[PDB]
Design a protein around this ligand. Sequence first.
Ligand SMILES: Nc1ncnc2c1ncn2[C@@H]1O[C@H](COP(=O)(O)OP(=O)(O)O)[C@@H](O)[C@H]1O
Length: 165
Amino acid sequence: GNVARVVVWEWLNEHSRWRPYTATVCHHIENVLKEDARGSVVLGQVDAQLVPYIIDLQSMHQFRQDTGTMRPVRRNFYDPSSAPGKGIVWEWENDGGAWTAYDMDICITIQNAYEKQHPWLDLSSLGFCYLIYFNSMSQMNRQTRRRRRLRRRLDLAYPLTVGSI
Ligand SMILES: Nc1ncnc2c1ncn2[C@@H]1O[C@H](COP(=O)(O)OP(=O)(O)O)[C@@H](O)[C@H]1O
């Protein structure tokens, strides 16, 4: 018995939410893990914005030289038929104008609703008090009625590996 599973590396933030890395970063981590289970992933080799980021596989923690934080990381897995298995990413635009990916469980839920031709999706049952409007491509706070923009891109697919039995 062999099954396929999508590899999504994730780091725990200050709100106790597991945040995903990008698919480019996750491929680089898995290549270091294949060669050395106790190695260090130097994300500065990938892009200049990731210079202060180091992921230590020896202790499974993220090290940031620009802030000093030590935050746990995990090697999580999702279903190949979900958005990370293809490369589909849903992102929302923060106050600084930067695009930020939703949590992976929410990203997969948004993509499932979009292809089911749902005009909108309510995330309240999943903890987020937000409404996703695909017609205006926006996210609305249920309490304040204020909105942010969101977009869909076909980025890189996250790595896929084999789980035995
Ligand atoms: N999808 C999201 N995921 C994580 N954080 C978010 C998301 N949307 C907004 N935030 C954060 O919540 C804060 C503002 O929430 P928002 O609902 O936009 O404000 P308001 O309460 O004024 O409507 C910001 O710090 C923003 O970074």
